[PDB]
Amino acid sequence: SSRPQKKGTAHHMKTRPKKTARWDIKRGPAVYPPLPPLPAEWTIVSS
Amino acid sequence: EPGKCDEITTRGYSISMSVDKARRVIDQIRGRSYAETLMILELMPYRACYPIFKLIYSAAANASHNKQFNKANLIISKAEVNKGITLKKVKPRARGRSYMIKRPTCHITIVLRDITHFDSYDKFLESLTPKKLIALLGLMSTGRRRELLCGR
Amino acid sequence: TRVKRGYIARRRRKKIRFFASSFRGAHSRLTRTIAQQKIRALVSAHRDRDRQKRDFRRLWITRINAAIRERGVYYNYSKFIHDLYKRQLLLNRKILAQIAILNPNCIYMIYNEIIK
Amino acid sequence: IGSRQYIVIPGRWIYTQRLKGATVNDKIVLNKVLLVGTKASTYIGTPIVTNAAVHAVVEEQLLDDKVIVFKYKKKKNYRRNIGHRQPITRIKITGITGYEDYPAST
Amino acid sequence: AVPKKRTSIYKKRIRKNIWKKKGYWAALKAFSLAKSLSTGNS
RNA sequence: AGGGUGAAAAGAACCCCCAUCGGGGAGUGAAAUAGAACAUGAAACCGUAAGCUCUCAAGCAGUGGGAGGGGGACCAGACCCUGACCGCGUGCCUGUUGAAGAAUGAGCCGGCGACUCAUAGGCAGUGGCUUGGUUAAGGGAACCCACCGGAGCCGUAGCGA
RNA sequence: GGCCAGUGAGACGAUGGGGGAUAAGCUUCAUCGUCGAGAGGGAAACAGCCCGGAUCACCAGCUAAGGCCCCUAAAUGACCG
RNA sequence: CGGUAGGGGAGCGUUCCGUGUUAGGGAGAAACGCGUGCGUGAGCCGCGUUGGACGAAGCGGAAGCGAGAAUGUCGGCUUGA
RNA sequence: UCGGAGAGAGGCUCGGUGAAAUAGACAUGUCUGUGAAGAUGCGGACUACCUGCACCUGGACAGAAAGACCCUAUGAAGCUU
RNA sequence: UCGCCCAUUAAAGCGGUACGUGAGCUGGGUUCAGAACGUCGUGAGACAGUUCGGUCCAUAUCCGGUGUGGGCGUUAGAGC
C-alpha cells in the first residue's frame, strides 16, 4: 500500500468530537427576567 | 476477675522442637478433657507428643497437688506455642558456597481449667431472664456469665 | 557533640501508621509502604471531595427527573427546570429531590401550581 | 443562608457558615424562607413567601473538623500538606412565623 | 526455577493450616484406636 | 564479635511432676509481670483470645457515599470497630521529549550513612569607632579575660612603559 | 548596574520551505500553539488535539468545549429533507 | 496565590552549653506505648499505665542535627517450605 | 522405521532431621483495543465457587553476571614500527 | 532454510505466531582463546575469504495447562 496512517496526536487531530453545524454553534445561555430586589438574609436585632 | 483461680499456667520451656511441628499436635488438644488428651498423646504417631505429654501430665499433677482439685474435672483451656531461641549451624554445600541450618526451639505453655469451680454460681443462673435479684446492689455475678455483659 | 537520632524517627512513623491502621495486609504494618500509601489515601480523599459535589448533584437530578416523569405523559426534567425559572423560583436541586423523597405530596403541589 | 438551602423545622438546630458579626447567644431572623409546609402546605410564586421570617438563636461559633488538603504530583518531589478548619456556626430554630399568603394544597 | 515475589502472609497461613489438619486427622485416628485397645481383640 | 539480677547472693531449704532438663507451690526480697537465657524492652516476624466480616468472584487494595451488625462500669442527632453494594483511582524513587511501566533501585524492620572545617578574596546584613580606623606576634597569680604592644595594613593623587 | 542560579538531549501540532520517494511517531531550519513544568472537563482508554489555567472550604448556582435510547448526567423534543 | 530545574523569605524539631547545683521529680523524671486538645505544617500540649531516676521552659548559643531509596552498611527476622 | 517389557537409584506416601537462589507491595484471569509503539494492574467485552496434591514449562520482556558485541571517555594496559 | 536429483503419490500449497517453541532438546553453522592456507600489512596484526579443534545452568512463587482431591454451596438431610 501507500496510505500512511493516523497515529499519535494525529489521530486526536482527526477524530476529535466537534460540532460544525451552524445552528448548534450559536445557542449559548438562556435569557430570563432578572429578579425583584430580595431582603437581607439574617437580620439581627437582639442581645 | 472472671476466673483467676480456674487455672494453673504450667509453662515448660526451651523444648528442642520446631514450633510448626508442635502446632500440629497442640492445635488438636486446645479444649479437650484431660483424660482424653492423655489417651491421644500416647497413641499418636509423632515425636512432637512426648514433651507435650510430659507437660500435660506435669501440669495436671501440679494442679492436683498445689491447688488441690480433681483431674477428672479439668480441661486444656489455652494451649500456646511460641518461638524460642534459635541456634545456627553453618553447613557446607557444593562448589565452595555455604548455607546455615537452624536448630529451632520453642516455649510451650498450657493453661488447665476446672469445669465445676464456678458451677454453683452458674447453675443458680438457670433462673430465667427478667429476674435482677438486686441483694448487695449488684453482688457476685462473677463466674463466667459467658453469653452477654449487656449491663448498661 | 555526637547527636544520635533515636526518638525523632518512630515518633513520626507512629503518626504515619495511625492513618493506615484500617488498611488491609502489607499496607497496615510496613513502615515505608505505609509512607507510600498514606500519601495516596490523602490524595484520593482530596480528589474525591470535589467529585462529591458534582456527583451528589447528578444523583439529585436523576431523582427529580424520576419523580417528575410520573405526572403527565410528555413532561420531563429539562422542561421542569425552565418552568421553575419562568416563574422565578430559586429552589436548588437538593431540596427539590429530597422533598420528592420525603414528601411527594409537596412535589405534586409544586407541579400543580407551576403549570397554570 | 450562605448561598445554601436547608429544610428547617422548629425546636431543632443547624450547622452553617460562620456568620460574620454574630455573637455567642444572640437571636436572629432569617428572611429568605423559600418554602413553608404543614397540613395545607404553601409554595412561593416569586422567591420569599412575603412577610414570612424564620426565628432562630445563635449557639456557638466553633470551627469544623480538620480537612486535610494535600497537593501531590508524581515523581516531582512535590508533596505539599496543608490542613484547613473552616469556621462554622451552630444555630437553633425557635419558631416559624405564620405565612398568611397563597394557600396551595388540593 | 525461582519465585518472583514472596507469598508473605495470609496465603502461607492458608497453606500451613491444611498441613496442621493432616495432624488433626492422625489425632482422630489415634483416638479411635484407644477404644479398640480397651476390651477383646482375639 | 560478644557490657548493665539486686542495696545486699538474701542466688531459691522443703514439697509436688520427675532418669535429666525444666516447671508449679514454698521461702528470701521494695520488686522474682528482678529467677541467673535475669535492668528500661520499640519495630519487623510468630502466635493465642474477643467484635464484626468474606466461598459467582475481576482485584496498586485506597478513597467519597454508606446497607446490616458490634461498643465504652461515664444516659451523645456525638464518637469508635467492622463494612452489603456503588462511583472514582495506571505503587514509590531515580531519570527522561516521553516511564503504570515489561527502564533503574529496594525481601522486610531498626540503627549507622553525604556541601564540612581551616585560611584567604569578593558581596550582603548587623554592630563599633569616624579627633581616620585597626592592631600582629608577644606580654597576662595560664586558657578566656582586664590592661598593654601602632611593627604593619587599609583610606587621604593621579598621570605615564 | 550589583549579588547569585539553572539551562545549553527537547517533543509533538499549524503554516513557509529544504533533504527524503513532496514515505516515516523520519530529519533540518523559520514563525506561532501546547507539553515540558498543568491538575480539571471533552475525546471509550489516549503527554503533545479541543475547552480551560487548580490559594482553601460548601451535600449551592450559571455556563465553555462537547452532548440528551440503556450501560452512564441531560429531549424515546420539535418541523422540513 | 498551578508549577520541574532553580532563586528568595518565614519557621519546627534533635543533642549538647550559658542562665541553673532553677521548679519539677521514688506521692514517679528520662523513656515506652495511647489521645472524641491544639497548628498551615514540621511539631506542640495534657493523660494515667508500663518504667524506675533524672531533669522543663523562657531568653540566648554550638553542631557527629532530621533518611526510603546509594546492586549503601551492621544487626535482627521472614519468604521459598 | 516404532515402539514395547522388565531390574535397580530416585520420583510418590508415612515418620525423623531440614536447606537454597529469589522476593517494592501484591486481593497476581482470556480476548482484542490503548499506551515509552509487545499489559494480571488502563478501556470495552468475554470467561470464571473457595482451596490443596500430582504432573507440564508458554508468559511474568522468569533467575543468574551495573553486556564480554557496538560505541563513547582528550579512560587503563599489552604488543608493533 | 532454500535448492537440485532418485522412487513414489490423491497431492507432494504458501505464510503468521520474538523468520512459533533452547528455565523443552540438539550444537552441525555463526560472534572468544590454539593452529594453518591464500591474500593485505615494514610490523604487531588483519580479512561475512578458507580450513581443523574447541565447557548449552535451572528443586516452578504466581499466571497458564493436563490430571485429580478436599471444603463449602445448592435452603431439612440423604441414597439412587
PDB file of N, CA and C in Angstrom, chain E:
ATOM      1  N   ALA E   1      11.732 -22.239  38.091  1.00  0.00           N
ATOM      2  CA  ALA E   1      13.050 -22.118  38.769  1.00  0.00           C
ATOM      3  C   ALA E   1      12.909 -21.338  40.087  1.00  0.00           C
ATOM      4  N   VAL E   2      12.705 -20.023  39.984  1.00  0.00           N
ATOM      5  CA  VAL E   2      12.832 -19.098  41.117  1.00  0.00           C
ATOM      6  C   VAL E   2      11.500 -18.399  41.352  1.00  0.00           C
ATOM      7  N   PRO E   3      11.178 -18.056  42.624  1.00  0.00           N
ATOM      8  CA  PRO E   3       9.969 -17.255  42.925  1.00  0.00           C
ATOM      9  C   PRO E   3      10.080 -15.755  42.604  1.00  0.00           C
ATOM     10  N   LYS E   4       8.995 -15.148  42.101  1.00  0.00           N
ATOM     11  CA  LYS E   4       9.001 -13.736  41.648  1.00  0.00           C
ATOM     12  C   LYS E   4       8.852 -12.753  42.783  1.00  0.00           C
ATOM     13  N   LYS E   5       8.013 -13.110  43.742  1.00  0.00           N
ATOM     14  CA  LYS E   5       7.801 -12.324  44.941  1.00  0.00           C
ATOM     15  C   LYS E   5       7.736 -13.279  46.102  1.00  0.00           C
ATOM     16  N   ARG E   6       7.403 -12.751  47.274  1.00  0.00           N
ATOM     17  CA  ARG E   6       7.051 -13.590  48.406  1.00  0.00           C
ATOM     18  C   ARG E   6       5.542 -13.684  48.589  1.00  0.00           C
ATOM     19  N   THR E   7       5.117 -14.848  49.075  1.00  0.00           N
ATOM     20  CA  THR E   7       3.724 -15.127  49.420  1.00  0.00           C
ATOM     21  C   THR E   7       3.313 -14.282  50.635  1.00  0.00           C
ATOM     22  N   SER E   8       4.311 -14.060  51.484  1.00  0.00           N
ATOM     23  CA  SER E   8       4.314 -13.047  52.543  1.00  0.00           C
ATOM     24  C   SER E   8       3.435 -13.387  53.743  1.00  0.00           C
ATOM     25  N   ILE E   9       2.122 -13.330  53.573  1.00  0.00           N
ATOM     26  CA  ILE E   9       1.239 -13.555  54.703  1.00  0.00           C
ATOM     27  C   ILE E   9      -0.102 -13.993  54.198  1.00  0.00           C
ATOM     28  N   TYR E  10      -0.858 -14.627  55.087  1.00  0.00           N
ATOM     29  CA  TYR E  10      -2.257 -14.962  54.861  1.00  0.00           C
ATOM     30  C   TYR E  10      -2.398 -16.181  53.944  1.00  0.00           C
ATOM     31  N   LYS E  11      -1.660 -16.175  52.832  1.00  0.00           N
ATOM     32  CA  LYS E  11      -1.553 -17.326  51.956  1.00  0.00           C
ATOM     33  C   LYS E  11      -0.738 -18.435  52.599  1.00  0.00           C
ATOM     34  N   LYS E  12       0.379 -18.069  53.231  1.00  0.00           N
ATOM     35  CA  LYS E  12       1.174 -19.023  53.985  1.00  0.00           C
ATOM     36  C   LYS E  12       0.406 -19.574  55.173  1.00  0.00           C
ATOM     37  N   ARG E  13      -0.487 -18.785  55.765  1.00  0.00           N
ATOM     38  CA  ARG E  13      -1.354 -19.298  56.824  1.00  0.00           C
ATOM     39  C   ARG E  13      -2.299 -20.371  56.275  1.00  0.00           C
ATOM     40  N   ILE E  14      -2.907 -20.063  55.125  1.00  0.00           N
ATOM     41  CA  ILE E  14      -3.814 -20.999  54.484  1.00  0.00           C
ATOM     42  C   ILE E  14      -3.108 -22.308  54.126  1.00  0.00           C
ATOM     43  N   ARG E  15      -1.891 -22.203  53.606  1.00  0.00           N
ATOM     44  CA  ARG E  15      -1.076 -23.361  53.307  1.00  0.00           C
ATOM     45  C   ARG E  15      -0.702 -24.175  54.539  1.00  0.00           C
ATOM     46  N   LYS E  16      -0.398 -23.529  55.660  1.00  0.00           N
ATOM     47  CA  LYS E  16       0.066 -24.264  56.827  1.00  0.00           C
ATOM     48  C   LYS E  16      -1.099 -24.963  57.538  1.00  0.00           C
ATOM     49  N   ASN E  17      -2.274 -24.347  57.474  1.00  0.00           N
ATOM     50  CA  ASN E  17      -3.388 -24.861  58.257  1.00  0.00           C
ATOM     51  C   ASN E  17      -3.857 -26.208  57.749  1.00  0.00           C
ATOM     52  N   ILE E  18      -3.810 -26.436  56.434  1.00  0.00           N
ATOM     53  CA  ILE E  18      -4.117 -27.758  55.883  1.00  0.00           C
ATOM     54  C   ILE E  18      -3.129 -28.857  56.374  1.00  0.00           C
ATOM     55  N   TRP E  19      -1.868 -28.470  56.465  1.00  0.00           N
ATOM     56  CA  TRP E  19      -0.851 -29.353  56.976  1.00  0.00           C
ATOM     57  C   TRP E  19      -1.125 -29.710  58.457  1.00  0.00           C
ATOM     58  N   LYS E  20      -1.537 -28.719  59.231  1.00  0.00           N
ATOM     59  CA  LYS E  20      -1.955 -28.997  60.604  1.00  0.00           C
ATOM     60  C   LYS E  20      -3.240 -29.857  60.709  1.00  0.00           C
ATOM     61  N   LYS E  21      -4.109 -29.746  59.717  1.00  0.00           N
ATOM     62  CA  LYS E  21      -5.253 -30.608  59.578  1.00  0.00           C
ATOM     63  C   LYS E  21      -4.898 -32.060  59.257  1.00  0.00           C
ATOM     64  N   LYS E  22      -3.812 -32.287  58.528  1.00  0.00           N
ATOM     65  CA  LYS E  22      -3.237 -33.637  58.454  1.00  0.00           C
ATOM     66  C   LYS E  22      -2.989 -34.201  59.867  1.00  0.00           C
ATOM     67  N   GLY E  23      -2.412 -33.373  60.721  1.00  0.00           N
ATOM     68  CA  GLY E  23      -2.190 -33.733  62.108  1.00  0.00           C
ATOM     69  C   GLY E  23      -3.471 -34.059  62.870  1.00  0.00           C
ATOM     70  N   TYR E  24      -4.496 -33.257  62.585  1.00  0.00           N
ATOM     71  CA  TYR E  24      -5.834 -33.438  63.151  1.00  0.00           C
ATOM     72  C   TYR E  24      -6.391 -34.808  62.797  1.00  0.00           C
ATOM     73  N   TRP E  25      -6.241 -35.187  61.528  1.00  0.00           N
ATOM     74  CA  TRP E  25      -6.769 -36.467  61.085  1.00  0.00           C
ATOM     75  C   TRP E  25      -6.106 -37.648  61.826  1.00  0.00           C
ATOM     76  N   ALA E  26      -4.787 -37.544  61.955  1.00  0.00           N
ATOM     77  CA  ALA E  26      -3.995 -38.512  62.696  1.00  0.00           C
ATOM     78  C   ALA E  26      -4.428 -38.597  64.146  1.00  0.00           C
ATOM     79  N   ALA E  27      -4.719 -37.455  64.753  1.00  0.00           N
ATOM     80  CA  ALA E  27      -5.232 -37.402  66.113  1.00  0.00           C
ATOM     81  C   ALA E  27      -6.563 -38.116  66.263  1.00  0.00           C
ATOM     82  N   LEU E  28      -7.457 -37.942  65.292  1.00  0.00           N
ATOM     83  CA  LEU E  28      -8.750 -38.620  65.340  1.00  0.00           C
ATOM     84  C   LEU E  28      -8.570 -40.155  65.314  1.00  0.00           C
ATOM     85  N   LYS E  29      -7.690 -40.577  64.421  1.00  0.00           N
ATOM     86  CA  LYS E  29      -7.437 -41.996  64.216  1.00  0.00           C
ATOM     87  C   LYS E  29      -6.799 -42.631  65.453  1.00  0.00           C
ATOM     88  N   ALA E  30      -5.832 -41.930  66.045  1.00  0.00           N
ATOM     89  CA  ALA E  30      -5.209 -42.372  67.277  1.00  0.00           C
ATOM     90  C   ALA E  30      -6.178 -42.393  68.439  1.00  0.00           C
ATOM     91  N   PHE E  31      -7.143 -41.479  68.475  1.00  0.00           N
ATOM     92  CA  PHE E  31      -8.192 -41.515  69.490  1.00  0.00           C
ATOM     93  C   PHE E  31      -9.083 -42.730  69.325  1.00  0.00           C
ATOM     94  N   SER E  32      -9.381 -43.073  68.071  1.00  0.00           N
ATOM     95  CA  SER E  32     -10.207 -44.226  67.761  1.00  0.00           C
ATOM     96  C   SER E  32      -9.539 -45.522  68.195  1.00  0.00           C
ATOM     97  N   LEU E  33      -8.219 -45.602  68.135  1.00  0.00           N
ATOM     98  CA  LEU E  33      -7.552 -46.834  68.463  1.00  0.00           C
ATOM     99  C   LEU E  33      -7.549 -47.112  69.951  1.00  0.00           C
ATOM    100  N   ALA E  34      -7.650 -46.074  70.776  1.00  0.00           N
ATOM    101  CA  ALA E  34      -7.599 -46.226  72.222  1.00  0.00           C
ATOM    102  C   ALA E  34      -8.792 -46.993  72.759  1.00  0.00           C
ATOM    103  N   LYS E  35      -9.955 -46.811  72.139  1.00  0.00           N
ATOM    104  CA  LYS E  35     -11.147 -47.570  72.479  1.00  0.00           C
ATOM    105  C   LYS E  35     -11.027 -49.023  72.050  1.00  0.00           C
ATOM    106  N   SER E  36     -10.419 -49.274  70.895  1.00  0.00           N
ATOM    107  CA  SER E  36     -10.120 -50.624  70.442  1.00  0.00           C
ATOM    108  C   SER E  36      -9.172 -51.334  71.385  1.00  0.00           C
ATOM    109  N   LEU E  37      -8.228 -50.584  71.957  1.00  0.00           N
ATOM    110  CA  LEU E  37      -7.289 -51.150  72.916  1.00  0.00           C
ATOM    111  C   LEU E  37      -8.032 -51.655  74.157  1.00  0.00           C
ATOM    112  N   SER E  38      -9.084 -50.943  74.570  1.00  0.00           N
ATOM    113  CA  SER E  38      -9.960 -51.368  75.671  1.00  0.00           C
ATOM    114  C   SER E  38     -10.985 -52.461  75.259  1.00  0.00           C
ATOM    115  N   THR E  39     -10.733 -53.714  75.674  1.00  0.00           N
ATOM    116  CA  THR E  39     -11.686 -54.876  75.626  1.00  0.00           C
ATOM    117  C   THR E  39     -11.687 -55.750  74.344  1.00  0.00           C
ATOM    118  N   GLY E  40     -11.308 -57.031  74.475  1.00  0.00           N
ATOM    119  CA  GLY E  40     -11.460 -58.040  73.399  1.00  0.00           C
ATOM    120  C   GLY E  40     -10.239 -58.266  72.501  1.00  0.00           C
ATOM    121  N   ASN E  41     -10.468 -58.254  71.173  1.00  0.00           N
ATOM    122  CA  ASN E  41      -9.441 -58.206  70.076  1.00  0.00           C
ATOM    123  C   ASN E  41      -8.901 -59.547  69.536  1.00  0.00           C
ATOM    124  N   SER E  42      -9.472 -60.662  69.995  1.00  0.00           N
ATOM    125  CA  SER E  42      -8.979 -62.010  69.665  1.00  0.00           C
ATOM    126  C   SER E  42      -9.311 -62.394  68.216  1.00  0.00           C
TER     127      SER E  42
END
